[PDB]
Symmetry: D4
Subunit: 159 residues, 8 copies
């Protein structure tokens, strides 16, 4: 029941994208919390969140942000937990700024980065699931089923 | 002694970059194997490697490749294990082709991507470590100590010559 | 009657683009098959498809995909047949990711890459036709007629 | 002895890159000619070359150029033969201008484009070979052997020094 | 009455953009011809057009094309006349391909390149006008008036 | 003697670039401090530095970082003072990642960004100077003289060898 | 009452973006002027504006422009005052041209550059406010309140 | 002896690139002047230069600059004469900032832009020559001869070593 995955985003505007991560986790029945934490507007909230993540039982953190996206990186700076970053598509630069701002982390503080947009949010949840599956037999079976269904469901020819 | 992390790369040329992941896993005392698997030259070897990774005891796979870098993505297509990708810097496009070829995975098959080059290789090992640390108290302690030292080792001012 | 060209795409979403390749081949009366084969979701389906392409009589394979587009490259990895790649336009990066993921193949395994989008799908079919025309006199004549009509039909001034 | 593949480039400076296509065709025993044809400096030479390629017995044309690379595209405009383009790496933009100038052909006139630089030149020859192999059993056998060797020649692990 | 400026574009699709060049020339009463000449689809038409431009009385050629834009460059290859290139905005890459394909001409064969899109078409006409103005006193006065009106008409504050 | 401008950078490697800001502030006689503050390795040090900057008497902060450059932005998140950011040139992407990571701040938390590299570092110091000059007549006079000299020092023609 | 901040833009088309800077300054009760000054169409107007800015009492200049954006740079060339540049989003290149044209100023003449678009216009106003706050106690308090409200208003979870 | 073409650049560092335009104009016997005019450091010098260019007898202006290259555009804002711009290659962004800063002029004030670097400088001179040739039969003849020689000087095949 207690969340093992924390999904955080810089603002309501990121929800359209991050909701895909939320749906995936719920789908696979992975207890998680979905919150808004702004690196730029609520820096202390971020520090406290990341710093106490481990103590609270969280195992993985999924963070999404766009533009000069610092949320994932700074979160990773305050936690020993794996941090997965989702580059939210920005209006002007289409998430290229979001991508470089998140993926180009200097050695020492990692952020496992996913694709720009919805695909990245969904994949961050799947990656978080594959991580949790390493020590959760039941979830591992559900993930196997999920991947198996994805594969089996692909049509043989276009409509 | 059994490897829990697999480091794979498309060729010997990728070693200059991937050696950084290898060194860090060793530093943190994480058993691992290092192999060359070419997505384009040995596609069947890749299929078999990724398909059997879980049963062989591997928990995480770190894959590096440059240019049209398909090694990480295709590995992830065959394994349920988390796959971390390292974009190897390419000559002409400086790893931008490597980066986009790895990070832009469509929804459904993830690849946790790290920075272009050496920094990415090191961080891939560190991310793999933080993943394994979730269920290995001893490692969690070594990682905590490693991160704590990194923080304490940062100088307060630059050597202004 | 048996297909000599195989058009494959990663998903239904690629059809809007790849249909242009299908139309062109049909137009020139080139027997072909149009299928969905996902490099990421159906890797074994891809391996089997590419590996047996030659045996089945296929002469050229046209593969389309977007984002981290691996379909053309991996297909080329399992076949000695010419593989033509079509970069499908992606939402965020407009097919720049698709393009680099397909064209930047390391030496040893080629993929003849065409333009991003519809133009690329149409040109992949035309390129496949020019290849088949080298050993098919009748088709060669039809291709000549096609190119001749394209040239002759260009208006002299805009409307 | 009659050439079945034509390798053309805009200038001597392109040879450092295009020599890789030449060497591979020779390796696979594919008769070919290597010439310099400048789309901008010798437009009429280009027109004549492309226009008569088919009647001269050529089956495939490999064209290389950098910067505002128009050689492949314009060649394709004059021949019904398949034209493969090699983006030669440029100084400032690292072949990105070369790449876009070649691959982005509007629908109606194709150019099978390969990677920027040496890898693209080699692959252009290999693609040309796979095209010719469709109707040349002997060549098909040599190509199969070449690809098989490439696969078997890949090391299983890197030389970790 | 005889055209002194030739506006050429690869296809009808370029008209939306090139019409701005046509309007400007007409505005300044510069005799010109507006035609469709495809470098890829009508290469011989292009060769003949460019090769005979000077003989026909043309002084400047304005050429527009998108994607792998070769029209301006090839036109410049067959004429000693100044060739101005207009990068037409392409669907996927927004004219970045058009721009690089036109501006990056190797030394020896120039193409004076303008901005991507409508602005470039309009500026190509203005640049052509400034060239013609060097030997046409009347036109020079009209261009001066045009530039003077542009400057004087700029508002002092936004609405 | 009390510093009114703070120059901070993520590591010693940034000094080669940031030294230009330091030298210019000294040239204009602007008291300042130069420190290393890592946004990723010493996040708490950054929080404290930025939070207390105003009370410590600082008026402007010049922050430099490369790659995923978060130092300027995060500093601005904790201080009401104007923060100027210098994109340090990165190896692979030539500072483009540094630039976008700094300049693209969402509305609400600004960072006055300067050019990639040395020019940006120098201009950050000059911008800081023009800010301080608004309420320091003496400095305003030195800046005016500096700008006037720059203008008068420009040669009228190049040395054509 | 006399303006201490000058907001200038190249044309009416920039207003959609620059209005955000105007709103912010008004919000914080910072006396300012909002004008249209074109670097390319009204160069002398720009020279005079920038050259006399200081004398007129202006403390900071916020300049916005798109495409080959020269307004901020040239303004900075004629004034000792701090110049903040706002890259207006351009149609084709989405403000990447605007950004590079403004931020890449050579050493000697600075331009504090903000994000492309609305965010940049808003941040330029905030940056100008943080500068003025250094010598205006009352404004400093209002800015503190503004930043405090921004931080406190961020929701804890998405809707 | 009176100059009909003016070559201007922002600094001595631009000369390495702009010298190519100078040499070509001399080769074609086109009288010209070469000066340094900084758009940012000597804005008033630029205003005066561009404003009086026409009355001084200049017919074409070739302007080169790198980075945030505003010299060509601002020159065009003050003169009715055609202005040709040469993007000087920049260190970090390889002239891409130079290119966009010059070519992307909004409708109303043109700048005929050439390629990044030396090739652009040479072509700017050649374009200027083709402009002047429209009303100078002697020059038109020299240009025709120059272009004809360029075409005839292209080798038929590469020196394959």
């Amino acid at each position: 029941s207690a969340p093992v995955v924390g999904i955080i985003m810089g603002s309501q505007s990121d929800w359209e994208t991050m909701r895909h991560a939320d749906a995936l986790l719920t789908e696979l029945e992975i207890p998680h919390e979905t919150l808004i934490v702004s690196a730029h507007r609520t820096p202390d909230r971020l520090a406290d969140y990341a710093r106490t993540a481990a103590e609270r039982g969280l195992n993985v953190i999924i963070a999404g942000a766009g533009g000069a996206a610092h949320l994932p990186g700074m979160c990773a700076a305050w936690t020993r937990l794996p941090v997965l970053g989702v580059p939210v598509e920005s209006r002007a630069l289409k998430g290229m700024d979001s991508l470089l701002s998140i993926v180009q982390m200097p050695g020492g503080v990692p952020v496992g980065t996913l694709a720009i947009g919805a695909s990245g949010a969904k994949n961050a949840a799947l990656l978080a699931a594959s991580i949790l599956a390493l020590y959760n037999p039941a979830l591992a079976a559900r993930l196997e089923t999920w991947r198996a269904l994805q594969t089996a469901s692909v049509p043989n020819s276009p409509i």
